Structure 1
Amino acid sequence: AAPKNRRTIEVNRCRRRNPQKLIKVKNNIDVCPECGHLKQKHVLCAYCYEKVCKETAEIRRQIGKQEGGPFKAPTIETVVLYTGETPSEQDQGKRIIERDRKRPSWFT
């Protein structure tokens, strides 16, 4: 199948500029209650998720440092501790991962 005549610019502008093809304005965007970095509703804020993913990567780095090589996977629960912060009397049998930092004021 072939074109029989060349489409004009009027037909083309009537096609590629109608409200079915235009980018729709969205209004789900508000500010995050902490740090104000323009989150979306129903979606975790990218800045705070970047914070907790960086700290999770650091904790997993120290965990991989404690577990030698592969296939260890300890049979007891874990807790992490920052500078100071002595092991409490419930955290006896749990494995201790201490990096070196202050405990940040959102991880309780």
Structure 2
Amino acid sequence: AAPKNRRTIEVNRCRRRNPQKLIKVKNNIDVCPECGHLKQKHVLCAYCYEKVCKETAEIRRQIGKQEGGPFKAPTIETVVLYTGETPSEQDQGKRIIERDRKRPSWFT
């Protein structure tokens, strides 16, 4: 195929400036009760997500430092702790993984 002429700037404007190709304005942006870093409906907040991801990464680092080599997988449940906090009576058969910081207010 080969054009016989040349498209004009008017046709280009009518083709690229149509409301179909323009980005639509979404109305799903709100605020978050906690922290508040501009979230969206049906979507988790990035701030708390990053916080829990960092916490899970630290817990996995501590587990790997306690386990040592690969190919382990204990046959008992696990429970994480923080500064102080003596182990309860119903947490005897569970693996204790203590950290080195205070307990956050969003983890009970």
TM-score, normalising length: structure 2: 0.98
Q: What's the CA shift string for 1:16-50, capped at 9, x where partnerless?
A: 00000000000100011101111001010000100
Matched residue SS, 1:49: helix
**Number of the residue aligned with 1:72:** 72
Distance 1:26 1:59 in 2: 38
1:91 to partner: Cα distance: 0.3
The sequence identity of aligned pairs, in percent, is 100
Q: What's the CA shift string for 1:54-75, capped at 9, x where partnerless?
A: 0110000000101111001000
**Number of the residue aligned with 2:57:** 57
Q: What are the ranges of 5 or more consecutive residues in structure 1 without an aligned counterpart? A: none
Question: Which runs of structure 1 show a deviation greater than 6 angstroms over 4 or more consecutive aligned residues?
Answer: none
Distance 2:81 2:22 in 1: 52
1:4 to partner: Cα distance: 1.2
Matched residue SS, 2:97: strand
TM-score, normalising length: structure 1: 0.98
Q: What are the ranges of 5 or more consecutive residues in structure 2 without an aligned counterpart? A: none
Number of equivalenced pairs? 108
RMSD of aligned residue pairs (Cα, Å): 0.5
